[PDB]
Amino acid sequence: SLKPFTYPFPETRFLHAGPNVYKFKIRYGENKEVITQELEDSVRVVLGNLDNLQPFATEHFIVFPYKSKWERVSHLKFKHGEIILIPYPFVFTLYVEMKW
Amino acid sequence: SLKPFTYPFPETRFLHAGPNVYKFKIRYGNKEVITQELEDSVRVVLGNLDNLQPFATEHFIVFPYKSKWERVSHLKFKHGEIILIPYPFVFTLYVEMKW
Amino acid sequence: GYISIDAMKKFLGELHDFIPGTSGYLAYHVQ
Amino acid sequence: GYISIDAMKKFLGELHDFIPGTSGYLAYHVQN
């Protein structure tokens, strides 16, 4: 349902989940469908542990999540049609490394 | 200024800086250089208490993390007659081989 | 040793890319 | 890549190991 993740290139993604929009940043240190699925899982884990970020290991990666203040988020308004989406006031940076 | 860190084994260290004491935890996965760069990492974390981010030393990547220091309100630290204030968060440095 | 992803809580609901100009999404800024 | 440690702000002040029972260090805990 999501655009393919950029395996080699770092990227910024805005994600709509429940009533919120989240700002994520992905940084990187063969079956790419599995890779995309586990990266989506990593995002879903970060979303499920918003307040207790810790590094974790997937089948192929170690993910080091970080949270930082989303500066000037008070100066933004996000809408889906007429619905107001609530921006989560923190940006998440996922440092993805290889599980050797 | 600090005693050498235990390079292979994980450890907990209480450090006195300024008027405060900080709780650090080191986890892993010529040792003088390693100890020096780990002290430098600790000093960087202390210099970026509010904006923790990962950084690379000559030999390691350091992933610093902050967590709530539980049961710290029931502790009192003193240096002689001076009252030291414990910083209410524990810093865990995940050290990984840079290559 | 790090915690396995399978031992963690996961948001399982719908998750979409927020792309203004698509799917009715919009974003604004103060002026 | 990752930011170099040499590009970070650094606390340059005095830094000591806190070891109760030495150098005048002391620590206490609440009790019933």
Numbering used by the authors:
A (entry chain C): 2 to 30, 39 to 109
B (entry chain A): 2 to 30, 40 to 109
C (entry chain D): 175 to 205
D (entry chain B): 175 to 206
What does the paper say about this structure?
In mammals, meiotic telomere attachments are achieved by a meiosis-specific complex of MAJIN, TERB1 and TERB2 (herein referred to as the meiotic telomere complex) that repurposes and integrates the functions of two complexes, LINC and shelterin, which otherwise perform distinct critical roles outwith meiosis. MAJIN provides the inner nuclear membrane attachment through a transmembrane helix at its C-terminus, whilst TERB1 is proposed to interact with SUN1 and cohesin components through its N-terminal armadillo repeat domain and C-terminal MYB domain, respectively. MAJIN and TERB1 are physically linked by TERB2, which binds MAJIN through its C-terminus and TERB1 through its N-terminus. Here, we report the crystal structure of the MAJIN–TERB2 complex, revealing a 2:2 heterotetramer in which two TERB2 chains wrap around a core MAJIN globular dimer.
The N-terminal structural core of MAJIN (amino acids 1–112) was recombinantly co-expressed with the C-terminus of TERB2 (amino acids 168–220), yielding a co-purifying equimolar complex. The presence of both proteins was essential for their stability, suggesting that the MAJIN–TERB2 complex is constitutive. We solved the X-ray crystal structure of MAJIN–TERB2 at 2.90 Å resolution through single-wavelength anomalous diffraction of a selenomethionine derivative. Using this as a model for molecular replacement, we proceeded to solve the structure of a truncated complex (MAJIN 1–106 and TERB2 168–207) in an alternative crystal form at 1.85 Å resolution. Both structures are essentially the same and the subsequent discussion is based on the latter higher resolution crystal form. The MAJIN–TERB2 structure demonstrates a 2:2 heterotetrameric assembly, in which two TERB2 chains wrap around the surface of a core globular MAJIN dimer. Size exclusion chromatography small-angle X-ray scattering (SEC-SAXS) revealed scattering curves and ab initio envelopes that closely match the heterotetrameric crystal structure for the truncated construct, with the wider complex demonstrating an elongation consistent with its additional sequence being largely unstructured in solution. The C-terminal end of TERB2 includes five highly conserved basic residues within a seven amino acids stretch (amino acids 214–220); this region is unstructured in the selenomethionine structure (in which they are included) and is essential for DNA-binding by MAJIN–TERB2. The MAJIN–TERB2 structure shows an extensive basic patch on the surface of each protomer, formed of highly conserved amino acids in the grasping β-sheet of MAJIN, suggesting that it may mediate direct DNA-binding through electrostatic interaction with the phosphodiester backbone. Accordingly, analysis of MAJINCore-TERB2C by electrophoretic mobility shift assay (EMSA) confirmed a strong interaction with double-stranded DNA that shows no overt sequence specificity for telomere repeats and is retained for single-stranded DNA.
